[PDB]
Symmetry: D4
Subunit: 159 residues, 8 copies
């Protein structure tokens, strides 16, 4: 029941993208919390959230943001937990700005970066699942099933 | 002494970059293996490596590649283990081709991507360490100490 | 009747683009098969497809995919046959990511790359036709006719 | 002699670039301080610096950073003072990652961004000077003289 | 009543973006003028506007333009006042062209550059406010309130 | 001994890149010719070359060019033979201008494009070889052997 | 009555953009012809058009194309006349591909390149006008009037 | 001997590039002047130069600039004469900032842009020459001869 994964996003507009991470974790029955945290607008909220994540029992944090997208990197700056970043596609630069500000983190402060957009959000949840699966046999089995279903469900020909 | 992390790279040329991941894992005392495997040039070698990773005891895979970098993604296609990708800098496109080929994975097959180059390799090792630390108290302490030392070692004023 | 060209694509969403390759081959009466094969979601399907292509009588393979687009390159990795790649335009990066992951293949594993989108798909089929025409006089003549009609049909002034 | 401008940079490596801002402020006789502070590596040091900037008498902050450059933006997140950002050129992406990470700030948290590299650092100091000149007649004259000299010093014909 | 900030834009099409700067200054009760000035179409108008800005009592100038966006830099070329630039997103290059022509100004002629689009326009006004706040206690307090309200109003979870 | 592959390039400067295609064809024993022809500077020379390619016995054309690279596309405009394009790396834009000028061909006039630089030239020769191998059993065997040797020659572990 | 400027474009789809060049030349009463010429689909048509342009009395050629946009450069390759190029914005790469294939011409074969899109088309016509104005006093005066009207018509404030 | 072409550049640093335009005009015997004028740093000098160009007898202006290149565009804003722009290669962005700042002119104020760098400067001079050749038979012949010589001078085979 207690969340083991935290999904945080820069703003409400990021939900259209990050909901894909939420849906996937629920599908795999991975207890989690979904919140809005802005690195630039709510810096103290982020500091407190990241600093206390491990204490609260969180094992992985999935962070998504658009524009300069400081959220993922700054979250990683305050927590020892694995942080996965999702560049949110936002208008002018199609998430290219977000991608670079998330993936180009300096040595010492990693952010496992996923694809720009919905696919990245979905994959951040799957990656978080693969991490948790390392020490949760039941989840590992459900993940195996999920991957097997994906592979088996791909059509052989276009419609 | 059995490896829990597997570092794979497409070529000897990628070693200059990936050695930073190897060094960091050794520093944190994380048993691991280091091999050269190319998705584009030794696809069957990759299939065998990735398919058997989990049964061989590996927990995390760190894959480095440049150009039309497919090693991380194809490894992830055959294993359920978390795969971290390191874009190796390319001559003409400065690693942009490497980066996009690795990070833009389709929904359903994740690859946690790090920065282009050495910093990326170092962070891939650190990320793998943070993953393993979730269920290894001793490593967790070694990691905490390492991170804290980094922060405390940052100078306060510039040297002219 | 037996296909001499194989058109494979990463997913159903790629059909809107790859159908242009299908239509062109049919127009030129080039026997072919059109399938969905994902390098990342169905790796074994791709391995088997590419490995056996030559044995099955295929002479050319046209592969299209978006995003990281691993399909064309990995197909070329398993077959000795000429592989032509079509970067599919997909959202965030307008197929620029697909283009680089297809065209920047290492020395030793070529992928003849075409333009991003529908035009690339159409040209992949035309290129496959020009390859087959080298040893099929009847097809060569039909291709000559197709090219001649294209050139002759371009209007002299805008409407 | 109390500092009215604070120049902060993520590392010693950024000094080669940021020293140009330091030199220009000194030339215009603007009291300032120069420190190394990293948003990604010393986040708490940044929080303390930015939170107390205003109460310490600072009027403008010049922040230089490269790569996933978050120093300017996070500083701006904790201070109400105007923050100017200088993108430090990066090896692979030539400062493009630095630039986008700094300029693309969300609405509500501004960072006045200057050019990539040395020219940017110089302009950050000049911009800070023009800000301070609004309420410092003496500085305003020194600035006017400086700008006028620049214009008059531009050659009229090329040397072969 | 007399304007202390001047908002100038390249054309009417830039208003959709620059209106966000206008609205913000009004919200903070910062007296200002909003005008259309084209560096390339009305060079003498810009020269006169920039040259006389300080004399007219202006303290900061916010300039926005799309395309080659020469407006911000050229304005800075003629005034000693702080000039803030807003790259306007315009079609073909999503404001990337505007961004570079504004931010890459040579040493000696600065333009404090903000984000591409509406957010940049809003931030240019906020930056201008933070500059004026240095010598206007009442405004400083209103700005503090604005920033505090922004931080406090960010939702804790997505809807 | 009659050439079945024609390698054309816009200039002597492109030779450093295109020589890799020449070498590979020779290695696989594929008779070919190598010439310099510029679409932008010797358009009539190109027209004559491309128009007569088929009647001269050529089966595949490998065209290398950089900058506003039009050689591959214009060659393809005059011949029905398959044309493979190699983007030659450019000084400022690192071959990006070369790549887009070559790959973005309009529907109806194909140009199979390879990687920027030497690797691209090598792959253009290999692609031409795979095309010719479809109706040349002997070449097919030589190609199979070549590809297999490449795969078997990839090292398994990195040298430090 | 005899055309002194030739406007050529890669295809019918380029008309939406190139019509702006046509309209401008008509507005300035500059006799001209507007045609469709494809460098890749109708190479001989282009060769003949460019080779004979000077003989036919043309003084300037405005060429517009999208994608790889070989039209402008190849036209310049066959004529001694000044060739102005207009990159047409086309889908995947927003005319960035067209821009580079037109502007990066080798030393010895120039193409005066204008902005991507409608503005570029309009400016190509204006540039052609400024060239013709050098030896046509009446046109020079009409151009002066056009430029003066543009400058004078820019609004002072947004609506 | 009165100049009919005016070559202007933002700085001495741009001369290495713009000298190629100067040399070509001299080769074709086109009287011209060469000056340094910066839009961003000597705006009034530019205004005076551009406003008086036509009355001074100039027919074409060739303007070279790098970075936030505004010289060509602002010159065009003050003169009705045709203005050709040459993007000077920049350190970090390799002339991309120069190119976009120059070519993306708004409708109504044209600037005929050439390639980034030396090739661009050479073509700007050649374009100016082709413009002047429209009403200068002698120059037209010199230009025809020059172009023809270029084409005939292109080698037919590569030197190894």
């Amino acid at each position: 029941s207690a969340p083991v994964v935290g999904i945080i996003m820069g703003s409400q507009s990021d939900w259209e993208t990050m909901r894909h991470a939420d849906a996937l974790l629920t599908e795999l029955e991975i207890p989690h919390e979904t919140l809005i945290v802005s690195a630039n607008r709510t810096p103290d909220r982020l500091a407190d959230y990241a600093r206390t994540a491990a204490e609260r029992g969180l094992n992985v944090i999935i962070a998504g943001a658009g524009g300069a997208a400081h959220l993922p990197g700054m979250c990683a700056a305050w927590t020892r937990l694995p942080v996965l970043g999702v560049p949110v596609e936002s208008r002018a630069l199609k998430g290219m700005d977000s991608l670079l500000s998330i993936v180009q983190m300096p040595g010492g402060v990693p952010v496992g970066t996923l694809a720009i957009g919905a696919s990245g959000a979905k994959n951040a949840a799957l990656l978080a699942a693969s991490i948790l699966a390392l020490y949760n046999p039941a989840l590992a089995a459900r993940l195996e099933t999920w991957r097997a279903l994906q592979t088996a469900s791909v059509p052989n020909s276009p419609i």
